[PDB]
Symmetry: D3
Amino acid sequence: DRPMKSMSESKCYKNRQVFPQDTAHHHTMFGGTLMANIDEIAAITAMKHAGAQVVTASTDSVDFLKPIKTGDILQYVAMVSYAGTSSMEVVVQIRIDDVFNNKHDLAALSYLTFVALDDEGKPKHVPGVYPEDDVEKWFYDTAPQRVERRKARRIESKQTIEYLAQA
Amino acid sequence: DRPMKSMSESKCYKNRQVFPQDTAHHHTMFGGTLMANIDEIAAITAMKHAGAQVVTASTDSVDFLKPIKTGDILQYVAMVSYAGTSSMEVVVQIRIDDVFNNKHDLAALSYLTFVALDDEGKPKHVPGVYPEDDVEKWFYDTAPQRVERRKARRIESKQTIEYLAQA
Amino acid sequence: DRPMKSMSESKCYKNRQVFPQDTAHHHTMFGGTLMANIDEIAAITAMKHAGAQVVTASTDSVDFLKPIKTGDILQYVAMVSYAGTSSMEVVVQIRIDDVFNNKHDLAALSYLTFVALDDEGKPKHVPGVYPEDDVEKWFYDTAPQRVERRKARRIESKQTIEYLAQA
Amino acid sequence: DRPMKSMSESKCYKNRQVFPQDTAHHHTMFGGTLMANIDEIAAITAMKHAGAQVVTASTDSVDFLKPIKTGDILQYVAMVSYAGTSSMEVVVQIRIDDVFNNKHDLAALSYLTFVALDDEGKPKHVPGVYPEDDVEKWFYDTAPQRVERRKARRIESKQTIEYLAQA
Amino acid sequence: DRPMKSMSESKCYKNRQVFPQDTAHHHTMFGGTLMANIDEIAAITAMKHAGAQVVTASTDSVDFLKPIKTGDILQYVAMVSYAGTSSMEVVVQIRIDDVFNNKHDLAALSYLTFVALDDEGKPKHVPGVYPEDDVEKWFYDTAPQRVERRKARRIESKQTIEYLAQA
Amino acid sequence: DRPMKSMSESKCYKNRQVFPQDTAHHHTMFGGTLMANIDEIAAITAMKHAGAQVVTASTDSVDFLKPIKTGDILQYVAMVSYAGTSSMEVVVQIRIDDVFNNKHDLAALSYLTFVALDDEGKPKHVPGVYPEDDVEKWFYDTAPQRVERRKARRIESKQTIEYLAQA
């Protein structure tokens, strides 16, 4: 079998305030901005895990649970919850860090899939992954099914592409 | 029954070149940037359909099919493929418009879900939707299943949230 | 004579909301931002018409007819209204798309001149242009005079340059 | 008669390097960016002259004389060359400051028209303007004709608006 | 005496790749950008420590030890090394996280001073600070002298301000 | 001895309004943004003095004297106050230009150190510097001590680096 890394090894933090330039609606963060930051921190985690350059292959989901207001401090935590052959599932959690009353509510949750690449751009084999704490193993344990859904979606999506191609 | 709008009514175009500031890897567009633009054009389509302010509730998927290089002209086409009670499924297609050889290859495909909101922020009833051309009815016809998958995912995702809440 | 393209062939749309970062005055779009977007969409239209890389040679005019507020949806429509030897006149129309009451008032109007360039940067011959609908032929019919004014202005402007050169 | 300010009083400088994010073509500044900066420095000059908030009413012209490359230092000099009742003509000169060989070639030239506004947004009377040095009086002396051209263009432009309005 | 927080309580991480838009020189991060990010993460740490809104009162130093290239992953670690009455000294460390060979070289080091503010903008009392690990107590132990230097500099700086005021 | 330039030769101005995107707190400029602009204008002055490419070696200080609000016009004046062998001390003054009541209060004051570099990146000898007006000679006369402080700080800072290196 392959070399294995702990989910803790690639675990990445990012803290960032919401500035007016991140908003669309009055004092409310715009989803596109949030998505760009999610992709940023997730890509960094995939790089650490893969020890390589990575690209986003797909955004499997972003659930926006809560409105995020200007001034809010956001904590992003990305980790690798699943390692395929050349691919990684990164799960990102985004919390609002309210310094005034010390709550850290979950504001969003995202799954993305990254592919590790060579010096010359072909998909590159990534190490395996194992959890240590409880959260890590929750994401680790529930990943096989998400991988499963993704396969079906990749089937349907190919159907759509092929239809558009002939039109 | 409710009032109905044609998918053509809310159909929105966006053309945008990829500039160095949109890239991460050498001369290659960064996924976060692409996601932000997808969300921008999708939100505009949802607004036109809903006749209202909208927020992104979830990013159901983004499939990145092709590398997008600096200089590339991107065409975004967003439309409403499904109307729930207060929600809309927007499908966005992103093509590279190669002016040199007149190909318009599909570079990415995205589904997002928007919720129309009041003047005071409660979810607002949206009109129904019907297709006219063939592409529109392809996305219209395949939407019920995607809605279905989303329900299961919203079930699993709630499980995850509840686990994290107690840790 | 040369090959001819319909003004409809290069006709480009762009939809974009005004975000706080686009403003200067309270909730009011800044003219520089509007000008940058005008140049973006105009350049894309010139590229489609020319089948080539282009540069902005001059901004012949931008008339700001109406204040544009934060949140406003802007529709940009660029088309080629005149084809010289290596140059194109792009006219851009900018409308506020008010989804709430379905008006599409003209917020700005711009004329720019682009030059199509080689792989090696010399000016490149562009195809001719002909209108099809009524708007297209309005811009097509009124272009010869604008071309004319531009010649006089290019005369005066050369005088100014030459004066500054000796000071 | 009204109070008069010297063109030197409102004369504004701006120095700014061209960074990769300002470019479109490889290592070449994008025209939209240049236009945004032109509008920025011109607006500051109009504010100093008017002693008030201003808006851009029109971009009368931007002549792009020279390619501007990444790294280039740009010097913007804005001044008021003409004062109407509530309006100002700002002329902006943009030079490349080559620190290596001490040339300061004219890279672009722009005329814009600003309107000074109240606390409540109505057009506000501006002071008159007089030149002191030779350049100032060149722009001062040649302004009456430019004002003249602008009147004719504002006539034609109104015709265009009215045509589009009925279509 | 006042309430005390561990330096670990307010310790904040930030991971961020260097993108082309962060650079000035070819593929080299621009110092201003680095400074903006330093200020961002430092402000977040001060907020967590203070449990309040903060402003940057001064940048006591930024030592740029190493060139930072495009693509580089930067790790920012901010902590409070000194607590005055209403002020905090935040020390930020910036490391290049080379995922390819697992070195984490120190690329920059910064000290800043923040002031915690009310709901109404007056300086607000902050808790005290104590270290736990070795690094924390190194910064904790060497802070009194830095505070000292700052006093002398604030003396000289006041002299300069007063000179400029009369000119 | 070496060639000498007047402090007036490299003296650079920059005028820039504060836009919403420059703020963090409501209508208040963010310190990081101010620092980025300070570094921009200072780098331009160092380039003019050095006749060369430069990098920021250190930010010796930024004193934020006054809150800077959205809309404020900022005037940056950078000059070289000290020339070492390959290094320059740039002092930047930032004033709020209140066009409404013609005050120009000092909002911030910064010292930075730049190193001039070759075509191949080694430190490059800079010309000497001499003052002409009173302000110039104030900064010129007080520089030797600041240079002095910097030496001590560079001593302490090296100690810190070496401690972190073994941990």
